[PDB]
Design an enzyme around this catalytic site. Structure first.
Site, short mmCIF file in Angstrom:
data_model
loop_
_atom_site.label_atom_id
_atom_site.label_comp_id
_atom_site.label_asym_id
_atom_site.label_seq_id
_atom_site.Cartn_x
_atom_site.Cartn_y
_atom_site.Cartn_z
N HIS A 1 0.82 -1.21 0.00
CA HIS A 1 0.00 0.00 0.00
C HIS A 1 0.85 1.26 0.00
O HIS A 1 0.36 2.28 -0.52
CB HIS A 1 -0.98 0.03 1.17
CG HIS A 1 -1.77 -1.23 1.35
ND1 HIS A 1 -2.80 -1.62 0.50
CD2 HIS A 1 -1.69 -2.17 2.32
CE1 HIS A 1 -3.29 -2.81 0.91
NE2 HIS A 1 -2.64 -3.14 2.05
N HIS B 1 5.27 6.91 6.51
CA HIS B 1 5.03 6.43 5.15
C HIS B 1 4.53 7.59 4.29
O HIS B 1 4.37 8.69 4.81
CB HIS B 1 3.99 5.29 5.18
CG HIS B 1 2.66 5.78 5.68
ND1 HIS B 1 2.28 5.64 6.95
CD2 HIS B 1 1.67 6.42 5.00
CE1 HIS B 1 1.11 6.25 7.16
NE2 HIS B 1 0.71 6.74 5.95
N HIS C 1 3.30 10.98 6.24
CA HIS C 1 2.64 10.78 7.54
C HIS C 1 3.58 10.15 8.52
O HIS C 1 4.18 9.13 8.22
CB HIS C 1 1.43 9.86 7.39
CG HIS C 1 0.35 10.55 6.63
ND1 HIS C 1 -0.64 9.87 5.98
CD2 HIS C 1 0.14 11.86 6.41
CE1 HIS C 1 -1.50 10.74 5.45
NE2 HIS C 1 -1.03 12.00 5.63
N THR D 1 -6.62 4.96 5.73
CA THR D 1 -6.60 3.63 5.18
C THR D 1 -7.37 2.69 6.10
O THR D 1 -7.50 2.98 7.29
CB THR D 1 -5.17 3.07 5.08
OG1 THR D 1 -4.56 3.21 6.36
CG2 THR D 1 -4.32 3.81 4.05
C1 LIG Z 1 -1.22 3.65 1.89
O1 LIG Z 1 -0.96 4.00 3.24
C2 LIG Z 1 -0.62 3.08 4.23
O2 LIG Z 1 -0.19 1.97 3.90
C3 LIG Z 1 -0.86 3.33 5.67
C4 LIG Z 1 -1.56 4.50 6.02
C5 LIG Z 1 -1.85 4.79 7.30
S1 LIG Z 1 -2.59 6.38 7.61
N1 LIG Z 1 -2.56 7.12 6.08
O3 LIG Z 1 -1.64 7.29 8.54
O4 LIG Z 1 -4.03 6.30 8.20
C6 LIG Z 1 -1.43 3.99 8.29
S2 LIG Z 1 -1.65 4.33 10.00
C7 LIG Z 1 -1.46 2.69 10.88
C8 LIG Z 1 -1.93 2.80 12.33
C9 LIG Z 1 -1.88 1.44 12.96
C10 LIG Z 1 -0.81 1.02 13.76
C11 LIG Z 1 -0.82 -0.30 14.29
C12 LIG Z 1 -1.87 -1.19 14.00
C13 LIG Z 1 -2.94 -0.78 13.19
C14 LIG Z 1 -2.92 0.53 12.66
C15 LIG Z 1 -0.74 2.84 8.03
C16 LIG Z 1 -0.44 2.48 6.76
CL1 LIG Z 1 0.38 0.95 6.53
ZN LIG Z 2 -0.92 7.92 5.57
#
Ligand SMILES: COC(=O)c1cc(S(N)(=O)=O)c(SCCc2ccccc2)cc1Cl
Ligand SMILES: [Zn+2]
Ligand SMILES: COC(=O)c1cc(S(N)(=O)=O)c(SCCc2ccccc2)cc1Cl
Ligand SMILES: [Zn+2]
Lengths: 261, 261
Positions: B64, B89, B115, B197
């Site tokens: 992603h 990311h 982010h 996401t």
């Molecule tokens: C394409 O974007 C992404 O892949 C991505 C986006 C977000 S975002 N855009 O900041 O909402 C988060 S946040 C992950 C938060 C989380 C941490 C641990 C366990 C579950 C979720 C993670 C990922 Cl892996």
């Molecule tokens: Zn993000």
């Protein structure tokens, strides 16, 4: 069922209406990177738009917009089949944020948007049949800005207090529908897309005119406050506001323009 | 089990991830009519951002985005609770339409968006546990535009080659993550929203810095062209492009600003 706000709002439509999550969705943001001049986009001709003032046409609140039924003798000339009118309707914002167009231009919303929906009457006997077939529908879109009072749009808006609730019908005397179109109709954006409401069928040839029309602040406020999504006797009324879909990813599409600059 | 295109794209996320159709969804358009200065919005302090040049940090293509794992001693001070870093990311568009930020400003996309995700370590033991809980997450967002070459961003982008396909991983020597932040970090937009996401949990305190950073045309093209969503030996590779969510409706809500001028 479906709505523009809350659990049954637009991010959920695909749960019941698979095409809403499919390809070729509308509306879209019209911006330079995806525009391409096409000299083959010749002018449309608007035939039988001048409806008789002695005849009357049905205005209905369908729970999602206000729609005026149009006669099949009204049609567009210049596409690869005759497309006959079926209905027109609007999309708008709310009193405190009058920025409810569906298409955007270079990231900005207009106040509201008019759609005049036509179907391929050469191939299909009605718009419902046409709605799920390839290039079955052609929709003209007019972007609406806050500006001068518009007597032509008022021929619709003066009847809104009579179709306030879902299911209500009124009669509108005929007028010249071409008066709802902007200046220089030969200048337009053209793309292949979808219905902007469930079932989101990807069967629409879109024509968005380049130039907006104006309606006044007071006419926008009337449109934004007159109507409800719910029946007259519903104990949980819902105002018909913000009835526009967010713009959609382009998915490799271009938008073709009949104007170069 | 979700993508940014075709049948498993963003309009379908809410089928398997119900919060994607719920309240407080991000990203949003930051436009002038909804901004309000809040003198309570004091500067954040970025603590433990200067990662030991002697440690290594896992960079992964997860299908992603490209994600850099961060250590839990890196944190934000200045919020009510301490929020500890978990990962950073990016989101971007594609070379034909290089305007792939998630947040927009007055309807305009920036080229890309960084982010830096943090979780409430005072209340919760790890980011996974925090992610669906009250006050769970805080994300810093940097808007990115094309301009001069950015050596600090190249500390990440020089490793993209090694994480071309889904599943692949590289190790990045620690560097000072504050170098990725823009000028005048005291100047920011703040609002309560969601992950952008799946699962789209409405548990994020957003901080979007006012000022963008710059990366060169070559660095932006590298980011757009270097990665695939698919595994190395997938017979139908898909490029990782256009990995941003469309803006969400945001009604009767404000975005607070730490700046007025
Ligand atoms: C394409 O974007 C992404 O892949 C991505 C986006 C977000 S975002 N855009 O900041 O909402 C988060 S946040 C992950 C938060 C989380 C941490 C641990 C366990 C579950 C979720 C993670 C990922 Cl892996
Ligand atoms: Zn993000
Ligand atoms: C909130 O807006 C609406 O309610 C609405 C929108 C569209 S749109 N915005 O042009 O995609 C159409 S087009 C309906 C086409 C059709 C006609 C006859 C039978 C089936 C479908 C119809 C309606 Cl009723
Ligand atoms: Zn419509």
């Amino acid at each position: 069922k479906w709505t523009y706000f809350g659990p049954d709002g637009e991010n959920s439509w695909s749960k019941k209406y698979p095409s809403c999550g499919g390809l070729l969705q509308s509306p879209i943001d019209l911006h330079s990177d995806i525009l391409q001049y096409d000299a083959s986009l010749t002018p449309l001709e608007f035939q039988g738009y001048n409806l008789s003032a002695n005849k009357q046409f049905l205005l209905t609140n369908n729970g999602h917009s206000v729609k005026l039924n149009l006669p099949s003798d009204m049609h567009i000339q210049g596409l690869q089949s005759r497309y006959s009118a079926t209905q027109l309707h609007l999309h708008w914002g709310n009193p405190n944020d009058p920025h409810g167009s569906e298409h955007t231009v270079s990231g900005q919303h207009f106040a509201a948007e008019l759609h005049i929906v036509h179907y391929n009457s050469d191939l299909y006997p009605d718009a419902s049949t046409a709605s799920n077939k390839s290039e079955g529908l052609a929709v003209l879109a007019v972007l609406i800005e806050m500006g001068s009072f518009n007597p032509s749009y008022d021929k619709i808006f003066s009847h809104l207090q009579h179709v306030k609730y879902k299911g209500q019908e009124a009669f509108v005397p005929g007028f010249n529908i071409e008066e709802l179109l902007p200046e220089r109709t030969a200048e337009y954006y053209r793309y292949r897309g979808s219905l902007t409401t469930p079932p989101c069928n990807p069967t629409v040839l879109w024509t968005v005119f380049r130039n907006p029309v104006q309606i006044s602040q007071e006419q926008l406020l009337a449109l934004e406050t007159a109507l409800y999504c719910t029946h007259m006797d519903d104990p949980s009324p819902r105002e018909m506001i913000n009835n526009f879909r967010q713009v959609q990813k382009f998915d490799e599409r271009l938008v073709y323009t009949s104007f170069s600059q």
